Write a protein that binds this ligand. Structure first.
Ligand SMILES: *[C@H](C)[C@H]1/C(=C/c2[nH]c(/C=C3N=C(/C=C4\NC(=O)C(CC)=C4C)C(C)=C\3CCC(=O)O)c(CCC(=O)O)c2C)NC(=O)[C@@H]1C
Ligand SMILES: *[C@H](C)[C@H]1/C(=C/c2[nH]c(/C=C3N=C(/C=C4\NC(=O)C(CC)=C4C)C(C)=C\3CCC(=O)O)c(CCC(=O)O)c2C)NC(=O)[C@@H]1C
Lengths: 160, 161
């Protein structure tokens, strides 16, 4: 989080955090409860979010579920939905941390090499994240929706 | 390094689990103390030099350590020593801010004892000086922050044993 980042930065300069850095951690902690609340709402609706996003995905990209597609078959479709779940999970981690590092370090570095090896069209994964973004933020208030949306966008941009 | 937030995220991740109620209690507990940590960090930062000076005065000055033959003898070694104390104080503050001692294991304690032993830096005296900073610090940040800081001051001392 920004606590780790500020520390690592100050250390690179062999100095104590600056007042500016301290103010950042300050805000970070007071908004902590809001972010935790956002993450909880997404965790609770986990199953519904994956079902609907999955449905919207296969609707936009029937190919992946049709014959010759990477997710053709009850089992491959299941595994595909399993991956969507992995990412929703990472996103709630991101939200509580206040930044994308958990999403990045657990599911983005090497993501292109992993999916290319499995033959999974990464553009379709991104579409699945777009779908989740839609179902997930629809569960939130205008303010929170925008806030959580940014984490989805980061992920979408990292797969495109 | 991990902070109190990422620490909870990693243990959840290794289990492949969404944040638990228990995990959420830990997050909330850190957030509640966040301001306290920032206020302590602020004071310590403003008194860093005086904290080190008093600790040295109280534990190392006017002993065999500073006289010819002592490890703190020669201006180069005296400075190297107060430099180390400045380090322990700065890193203990980081760890207190993060609510986690990992930065200590990774950036401070790794190979420290061996280095000290190699150079002949007395660990017992170094530990005494850190404990003295512990006391001087509590008296500036107050009992609350003082005990938190003490956890990390002790962590370092333990890693030198
Ligand atoms: C769903 C939107 C898309 C889809 C997915 C799909 N994935 C697999 C197989 C795997 N996916 C992973 C994924 C991850 N591992 C990680 O560590 C992370 C980050 C947290 C992710 C996201 C892995 C490891 C596999 C391998 C199987 C395993 O889990 O051991 C499949 C199966 C493909 C196969 O050939 O067996 C599928 C179908 N496929 C699509 O077409 C959608 C676009
Ligand atoms: C002061 C309380 C005691 C003391 C210290 C002393 N230390 C050294 C030399 C080194 N100290 C370190 C320690 C660190 N270096 C770092 O970068 C960090 C941050 C994580 C730490 C904690 C290291 C690596 C050295 C060796 C390299 C260097 O000099 O930079 C000296 C000098 C040793 C010499 O013979 O030149 C001294 C004197 N000495 C005492 O007597 C006190 C008990």
């Amino acid at each position: 989080s920004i606590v780790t980042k500020s520390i690592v930065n100050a250390d690179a300069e062999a100095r104590y955090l600056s007042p500016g850095e301290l103010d950042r951690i300050k805000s970070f902690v007071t908004s902590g409860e809001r972010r935790v609340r956002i993450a909880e709402t997404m965790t609770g609706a986990r199953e519904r979010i994956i079902k609907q996003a999955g449905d919207q995905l296969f609707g936009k990209r029937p190919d992946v579920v049709s014959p010759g597609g990477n997710a053709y078959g009850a089992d491959m479709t299941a595994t595909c939905l399993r991956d969507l779940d992995y990412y929703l999970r990472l996103i709630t981690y991101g939200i509580v941390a206040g930044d994308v590092t958990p999403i990045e370090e657990i599911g983005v570095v090497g993501v292109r090499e992993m999916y290319k090896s499995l033959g999974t069209p990464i553009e379709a994964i991104a579409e699945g994240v777009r779908a989740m973004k839609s179902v997930a933020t629809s569960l939130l208030s205008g303010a929170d929706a925008a806030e959580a949306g940014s984490y989805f966008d980061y992920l979408i941009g990292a797969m495109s | 390094m991990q902070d109190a937030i990422t620490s909870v995220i990693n243990s959840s991740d290794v289990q492949g689990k969404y944040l638990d109620a228990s995990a959420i209690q830990k997050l909330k507990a850190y957030f509640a103390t966040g301001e306290l940590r920032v206020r302590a960090a602020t004071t310590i930062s403003a008194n860093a030099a005086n904290i080190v000076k008093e600790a040295v005065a109280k534990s190392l000055l006017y002993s065999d350590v500073t006289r010819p033959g002592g490890n703190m003898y020669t201006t180069r070694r005296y400075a190297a020593c107060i430099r180390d104390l400045d380090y322990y104080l700065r890193y203990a503050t980081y760890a207190m801010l993060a609510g986690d001692p990992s930065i200590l294991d990774e950036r401070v304690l790794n190979g420290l004892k061996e280095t000290y032993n190699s150079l002949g830096v007395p660990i017992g005296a170094t530990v005494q000086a850190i404990q003295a900073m512990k006391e001087v610090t509590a008296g500036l940040v107050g009992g609350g922050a003082g005990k938190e800081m003490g956890i990390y001051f002790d962590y370092i001392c333990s890693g030198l044993s």
